[PDB]
Scaffold this active site. Structure first.
Site, PDB file in Angstrom:
ATOM      1  CG  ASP A   8      -2.274   0.729   0.934  1.00 44.14           C
ATOM      2  OD1 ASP A   8      -2.362   1.909   1.288  1.00 44.14           O
ATOM      3  OD2 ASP A   8      -3.190   0.179   0.292  1.00 44.14           O
ATOM      4  CG  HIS A  44      -5.262   3.900   1.309  1.00 44.63           C
ATOM      5  ND1 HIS A  44      -4.763   2.709   0.842  1.00 44.63           N
ATOM      6  CD2 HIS A  44      -6.599   3.863   1.087  1.00 44.63           C
ATOM      7  CE1 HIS A  44      -5.755   1.969   0.366  1.00 44.63           C
ATOM      8  NE2 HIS A  44      -6.882   2.650   0.504  1.00 44.63           N
ATOM      9  CB  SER A  95      -8.985  -0.377   0.870  1.00 43.12           C
ATOM     10  OG  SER A  95      -8.304  -0.250  -0.373  1.00 43.12           O
TER      11      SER A  95
END
Lengths: 278, 92, 13
Positions: free
Chosen positions: A22, A58, A218
């Protein structure tokens, strides 16, 4: 009490290492400090324009969802992070491939227990990405991926469409498919099950003790990665097929209103919401 | 025969960089030699190339920055299974 | 909303 999503999956994970491909992560956030090891791995494309809302927003959130002290699924799980997404959340298929290969090379040099690899990202259908995932799976690694947020058939995206991977769509607090802007969770035969993916509280990289709610496949996939980590720690000898069977067995059945999906996708889309065993 | 693939979503394509995937049994030494052969053949035709990475462990092959002009040539190389144009992935 | 502590989040939710 506890976050809705953590209640939804509850009718930890210490044997298992979870690899995260990620963005960068704030590894000293209190929620994940000492549970996450940032690998020296970086392979990302240059940012286009001058945008992002931190570079590590994120990934930090997803690490928290998997393993976070206060808001995590598998609170005893250790994690390893690879950076394959830039500050704007964008990566390349080739960067992802190199990361998957890094994971396999790392395992061969220093083997540990069961590995779960979380791929909270999607691009267009990719023969090579699908092949690499398949290969990594056959090597004995469990891969969990986001179905994609395009309100579309997951079979048109990778790694969502890959065989031998666990593909996860998102549902909300009412067990309904998540809307995200004008789009939302993907669906279809390439999705294995759904998991909480709306309004999910987790580590915010804004500060060492900060939390923020995020939505997406996600986050849904991060739940299943946590659940997988818990199931594999309890039963380390499970094969991928048995793990898949356990995930289905312990899922909530037929709670999703399938009218949300296009007519032809309803039969094809599994009506399952992931949950931990009792 | 080796085939060429590129992302169906036009805006997500990354022309100019290619994943060359070799046949399953291909050994690292063969992959490396195949990469250098491509660079040699491309150079004779006045094209620059850059081998960004050589894959082994999951799939054999390499990552090459080069003109798409060279695709017909690259597809004739020994050990090639297929070639895919690089493309973008996104945080979900 | 970014909560500055888990307690802050608990108080709000």
């Amino acid at each position: 009490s506890i976050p809705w999503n953590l209640e939804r999956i509850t009718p930890g994970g210490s044997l298992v290492e979870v690899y995260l491909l990620d963005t960068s992560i704030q590894s000293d956030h209190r929620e994940i400090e000492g549970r996450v090891m940032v690998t020296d791995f970086e392979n990302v494309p240059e940012e286009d324009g001058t945008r992002f809302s931190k570079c590590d927003s994120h990934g930090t959130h997803l690490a928290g969802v998997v393993s976070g002290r206060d808001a995590g699924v598998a609170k005893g799980a250790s994690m390893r992070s690879l950076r394959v997404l830039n500050c704007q959340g964008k990566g390349t298929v080739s960067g992802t491939l190199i990361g998957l290969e890094f994971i396999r090379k790392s395992q061969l040099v220093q083997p540990v227990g069961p590995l779960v690899v979380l791929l909270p990202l999607a691009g267009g259908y990719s023969r090579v990405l699908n092949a690499a995932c398949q290969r990594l799976a056959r090597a004995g690694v469990v891969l969990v991926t986001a179905a994609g947020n395009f309100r579309d058939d997951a079979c048109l995206y990778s790694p969502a469409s890959a065989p031998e991977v666990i593909t996860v769509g998102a549902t909300n607090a009412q067990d309904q498919p998540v809307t995200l802007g004008t789009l939302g969770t993907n669906f279809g035969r390439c999705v294995d099950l759904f998991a909480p993916g709306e309004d999910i509280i987790g580590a915010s990289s804004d500060c060492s003790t900060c939390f923020v709610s995020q939505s997406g496949t996600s986050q849904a996939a991060a739940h299943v990665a946590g659940i997988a980590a818990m199931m594999l720690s309890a039963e380390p000898e499970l094969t991928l097929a048995e793990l898949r069977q356990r995930l289905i067995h312990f899922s909530a059945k037929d709670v999703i209103n399938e009218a949300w999906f296009p007519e032809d996708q309803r039969v094809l889309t599994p009506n399952l919401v992931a949950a931990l065993p009792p | 025969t080796a085939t060429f693939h590129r992302c169906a979503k036009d805006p997500w394509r990354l022309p100019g960089t290619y994943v060359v995937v070799l046949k399953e049994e291909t050994h690292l030494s063969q992959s490396e030699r195949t990469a250098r052969r491509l660079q040699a053949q491309a150079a004779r035709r006045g094209y620059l190339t850059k081998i960004l990475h050589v894959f082994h462990g999951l799939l054999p092959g390499f990552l090459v920055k080069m003109s798409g002009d060279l695709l017909e040539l690259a597809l004739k190389l020994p050990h090639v299974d297929y070639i895919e144009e690089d493309s973008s992935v996104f945080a979900q | 909303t970014v909560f500055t502590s888990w307690e802050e989040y608990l108080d709000w939710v």
